[model samples]
Target: SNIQSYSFEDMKRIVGKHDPNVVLVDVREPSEYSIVHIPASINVPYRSHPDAFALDPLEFEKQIGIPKPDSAKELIFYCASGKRGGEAQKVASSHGYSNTSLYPGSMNDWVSHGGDKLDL
Candidate 1:
């Protein structure tokens, strides 16, 4: 299957266990991230979805602090309510970043489900 989607409980378990190959990516902006977010999530704000977007995969990886893109590794993306995460996933996919997943529940569901979150 390609680009699996998840609710927060499923993700909480994945993250709580600290799985090595999975990367938890927050696609929200810096201001939103400054308020609160899941622990261990690296910010990769989607910015605005441009009509014609230009992506630099190396630069994207640089911003997220990930050295390389691996198909074997799972990319778990989440934004305030998941839309941007979907966009981020698409961006990554276009850049040849494979094994992506969307956390549809995002921070809203994460908090509602009592999933752990940390402040900036």
Candidate 2:
């Protein structure tokens, strides 16, 4: 299977198995993140600019508090229904980031699967 085809179960399994190296990125807006989000996920609004469909690598790294491309790490992106996350995955892939994946079920599924949500 392609790396991009992650289901909610897959995400849960990964979260269970892996160490805290995976970068959980919420592609939603700040307002949404303030309401509820997966704990430890970083907020990097996908539409930082209205016309841009995906994030530029440099800017994305900066937003996430990382350095250059080599400093880029394992990343899983999720949005409301996975649309924005999928788009961000494509953009990241095109920019030559190899370890990026998208959680297709996103925040909706996360909540449905009894994943804890933190209101911060």
Candidate 3:
């Protein structure tokens, strides 16, 4: 299947078993992430708190060290569920970053699939 068809196992397989070509992002609260997060996933916190990310989310692009939008790489956005990941997908798309996919279950699903977590 193509990258677009990828789901949780696809992510796990690509990252650990197969050749991976995607950027992983964790869209949750800062503290929520501090507990445990998928290894190699960067924290962007789509909106850690209410009203956050309201004015300048682009800063998150740079601040989080996100690859340039023009770069040829797929991005995977995840949250506890699909909610914030969907929001982040839109946020990134609004900034010209459209090569992205959403992880419906995020880490919650990842953990069930044996995705390892790394302490930060």
Quick one: best lDDT, which candidate? 1
lDDT of 1 by residue, 1-120 (tens): 656888766886787678878888787888988888787777777774321113455754555555444557788888888788888788777766667889987987887876754232
Provide the global lDDT of candidate 2 against the true structure. 0.70
By TM-score: ranked, best first = 1, 2, 3
Task: Give the total clashing residue pairs for model 2.
Answer: 0
The lowest-lDDT stretch of 10 consecutive residues in candidate 3 is 48-57
**Positional deviation of 43 in candidate 2, in angstroms?**
1.1
Q: Which candidate is the best by TM-score?
A: 1
- CA error at residue 97 for candidate 3, angstroms: 0.9
| lDDT tens readout by residue for model 3, 1-120 | 332535776776667743356777678887888877877767777665322233354654555555333335677778887688778776665655657777877877877766655222
Candidate lDDT scores, in order, read 0.72, 0.70, 0.65
Query: Ten-residue segment with the worst summed lDDT in candidate 1?
Result: 48-57
Clash totals for all models, in order? 0, 0, 0
Model 1 alpha-carbon miss at residue 24, Å = 0.4
